[PDB]
């Protein structure tokens, strides 16, 4: 049928010319049923037409098209566990979004897609319903109602075929969990494919690190209960026999470094096959080759297994590739952080030969910084150069400010409150600025701190701090006095060995003492300072200003931060008053902790702690009595009351500030006091020595699935504190508080673990060597306090 004109009925958004181009038919040509059907199908596939009808009039080919209503808005209801924005993103990725047309047939498809999304996120009973609200001018609103349901949780993890290791011991290291006690933080009990794959890899590594060279995971099964609220996981495995390592062999184009590589492949005959050691050997060879300019030093290890003797021999194939040179290192995405902040973390130099280890280390340091959510690398090639590249780092910037507020409890200090506000990347310059405060039974502290982490390009840091502190002695198990102090401090920090770190600095502090209880030690210090106060009342006051030089050295080697099983930590701190200050003295302290494992699995450990301290005055003066060293309590000698070891106060007969019978007073003049007077309340000393030996053992009764999250210890503590200036000749009737030989000893048991309230530490000890005045406190605990 020849066509002379073309007409359309229903074209609203699609252009007439666009439709004419889209339709294969054109005016002035023959048209048949096949052509009409082809045009109808093309219009249908255009995606904007709901019903298409190509009817023929007398002369004109009239087309009736019902354009699909435009989507004006998409609404969701019931997406309690799904973000609306993320759901919109998923829908628009699928294809449905605002502005486009709504197909009156793909509603079921959209609903099933959303149900599949819910199945993926975890809910297996989820339902989705779609409602359509037509609106004039060929518009429509699509609303979605979600019945999320109840998520499915893991009910059991089973391993079939393990005869040397128990299933509880094996699945103790998995990420997926099937039991979560209310008193531990072990994890959530949800199911995820990525976690399952990671767990399979963890199981394979666990067995391969023990000599089972023929270990094989036959299969895995996942089942749901008929009601779809529990998930059962089963792992069918096949552990072989333990194998020995007969020897190693290296071959390839070693590039003349065979002599240096052989030393990296030295083993003791008769060793058990291990997988982590083989990976370490490969990494060592890769670093050796990288140090000689090779960017991609490929290495592969193939084991050859002999069942007759049960021995494995490795075959290491090494290929040292070519040399690539970095032309540029580019950072993109650092809208806030300046270039140098990211650039100074690079282990690789632009304009030198390439190193993949160095690129990876730079990426790891960027991740450790904490200013970014994601970090990616892309070593691009340079057109026209066969051996040049450009390294690109792509980062997404995180938000670095924060508030924090915390509460803790303990026998040492009672209820403890902490608060603060911090900014780790001030104006993208790298400076860290914060203000913090803390409060407990016996002191209140507030500080403002500003730190530059790269005062020198090598990494030397420069920090400054302003502080205010308020301390009430009688609330801390000491003789009564009040000290309010404030000051400033500036410090440098030098890294030297990646384990060692030195620091030196200067400080100024003003101390104001009041409400001092008359006693021999305080009135011995005050006399040396030049004061002549009265010994009949505690309406006292004394102020001093001091400039001090501070120094310290830290050595950290602990393998892990939480529940370490090997290493040592040593911390030396010092202080000396520089001339021109009121107080002339020096002070030194030394902290030591050492872990020694006595097994290959690191479950039985020996811990040794020591704490030493000594201070004294220089110009005929004495160390201030508020600088003393205290011992006792859960920190130093468990089983004793805090700050109870050491010298005890000796008072003068004085009138109470406001006497009132029925109250216990320190032998006040209004109670028949006419001479010096002993006490049982500690004052401290200027020399201190404490030691502790502890044996860490597996928890006996807890289930083996999570027995590694609780630490159990048996400890023995010794300690002593003394005052080297106490002259026994004058005070003959009272004990000699300058003797270092009065050692206090206790022994007992302790438990530690992480709870929903924070860290929890409990201890029960029995002080079996103590002296008159010391107060015992067997049961001690600390809840959620880490400040």
């Amino acid at each position: 049928f020849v066509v002379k004109d073309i007409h359309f009925e229903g074209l609203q958004r699609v252009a007439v010319g666009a439709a004419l181009l889209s339709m294969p038919v054109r005016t002035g040509d023959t048209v048949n049923d096949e052509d009409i059907s082809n045009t109808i199908r093309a219009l249908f596939a255009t995606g904007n037409f709901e019903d298409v009808r190509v009817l023929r009039d007398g002369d004109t080919l009239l087309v009736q098209v019902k354009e699909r209503p435009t989507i004006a808005s998409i609404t969701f209801s019931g997406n309690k566990s799904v973000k609306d924005d993320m759901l919109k993103q998923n829908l628009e990725a699928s294809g449905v979004r605002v502005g486009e047309s709504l197909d009156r047939t793909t509603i079921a498809d959209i609903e099933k897609g959303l149900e599949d999304f819910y199945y993926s996120v975890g809910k297996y009973s989820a339902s989705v319903k779609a409602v359509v609200t037509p609106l004039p001018r060929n518009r429509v609103d699509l609303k979605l109602v979600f019945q999320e349901g109840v998520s499915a949780e893991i009910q059991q993890i089973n391993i079939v075929g393990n005869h040397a290791f128990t299933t509880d011991e094996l699945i103790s290291h998995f990420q997926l969990r099937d039991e979560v006690p209310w008193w531990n933080v072990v994890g959530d009990r949800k199911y995820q494919k990525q976690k399952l794959a990671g767990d399979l890899e963890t199981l394979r590594s666990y067995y391969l690190d023990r000599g089972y060279a023929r270990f094989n995971i036959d299969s895995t099964q996942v089942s749901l209960t008929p009601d779809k609220k529990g998930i059962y996981v089963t792992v069918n495995i096949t552990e072989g026999d333990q194998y020995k390592l007969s020897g190693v062999e290296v071959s390839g184009n070693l590039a003349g470094h065979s002599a240096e590589i052989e030393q990296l492949t030295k083993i003791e005959p008769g060793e058990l096959y291990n997988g982590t050691k083989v990976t370490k050997m490969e990494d060592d060879i890769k670093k050796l080759l990288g140090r000689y300019g090779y960017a991609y030093p490929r290495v592969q290890s193939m084991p050859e297994i002999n069942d007759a003797d049960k021995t494995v021999k490795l075959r290491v194939n090494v290929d040292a590739g070519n040399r690539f040179y970095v032309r540029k290192i580019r950072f993109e995405g650092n809208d806030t952080s300046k270039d140098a902040v990211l650039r100074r973390e690079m282990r690789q130099m632009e304009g030198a030969w390439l190193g993949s280890d160095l690129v990876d280390q730079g990426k790891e340091r960027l991740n450790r910084l904490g200013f970014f959510e994601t970090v990616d690398t892309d070593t691009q090639r340079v057109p026209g150069s066969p051996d040049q590249v450009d390294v690109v780092y792509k980062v997404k910037e995180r938000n670095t400010g924060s508030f924090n507020f915390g509460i803790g409890y303990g026998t040492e200090s009672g209820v403890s409150f902490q608060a603060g506000v911090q900014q780790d990347n001030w104006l993208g310059t790298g400076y860290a600025v914060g203000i913090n405060g803390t409060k407990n039974d016996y002191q209140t502290y507030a500080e403002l701190s500003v730190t530059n982490p790269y005062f020198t390009v090598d990494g030397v840091s420069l920090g400054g701090r302003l502080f205010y502190n308020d301390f009430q002695a009688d609330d801390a198990d000491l003789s009564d006095y009040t000290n309010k102090s404030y000051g400033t401090d500036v410090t440098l920090g030098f890294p030297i060995n990646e384990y060692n770190s030195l620091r030196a600095g200067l400080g100024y502090v003003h101390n104001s003492l009041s409400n001092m209880q008359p006693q021999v030690a305080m009135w011995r210090y005050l006399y040396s300072m030049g004061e002549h106060p009265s010994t009949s009342d505690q309406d006292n006051s004394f102020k001093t200003d001091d400039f001090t030089f501070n120094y310290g050295w830290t050595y950290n080697k602990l393998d892990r931060g939480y529940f370490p099983t090997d290493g040592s930590r040593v911390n030396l701190t010092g202080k000396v008053t520089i001339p021109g200050s009121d107080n002339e003295y020096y002070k030194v302290t030394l902290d030591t902790a050492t872990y020694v494992p006595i097994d290959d699995d690191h479950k039985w450990v020996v811990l040794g702690r020591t704490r030493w301290g000594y201070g004294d005055g220089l110009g005929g003066k004495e160390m201030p009595f508020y600088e003393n060293f205290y011992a006792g309590g859960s920190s130093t000698v468990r089983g004793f009351q805090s700050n109870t070891i050491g010298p005890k106060a000796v008072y003068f007969p004085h009138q109470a500030s406001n006497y009132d019978p029925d109250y216990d007073y320190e032998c006040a003049t209004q109670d028949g006091a006419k001479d010096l007077c002993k006490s049982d309340d500690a004052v401290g000393g200027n020399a201190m020595a404490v030691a502790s030996l502890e044996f860490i053992t597996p928890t006996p009764f807890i289930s083996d699935k999570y027995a590694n999250s609780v630490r159990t210890s048996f400890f023995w503590d010794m300690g002593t504190v003394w005052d080297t200036n106490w002259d026994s000749s004058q005070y003959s009737g009272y004990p000699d508080y300058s003797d270092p030989s009065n050692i206090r000893m206790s022994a007992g048991i302790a438990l530690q673990w992480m709870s929903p309230l924070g860290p929890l530490v409990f201890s029960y000890a029995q002080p079996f060597k103590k002296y008159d005045g010391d107060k015992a406190e067997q049961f001690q605990f600390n809840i959620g306090k880490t400040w």
């Binding site: 938000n399 670095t400 400010g401 924060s402 508030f403 924090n404 507020f405 915390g406 509460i407 803790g408 902490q418 506000v421 309230l757 924070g758 959620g784 880490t786």
Partner: peptide, 7 residues
């Protein structure tokens, strides 16, 4: 305990 919230 200790709650921490980023601003």
């Amino acid at each position: 305990w200790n709650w921490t919230k980023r601003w």
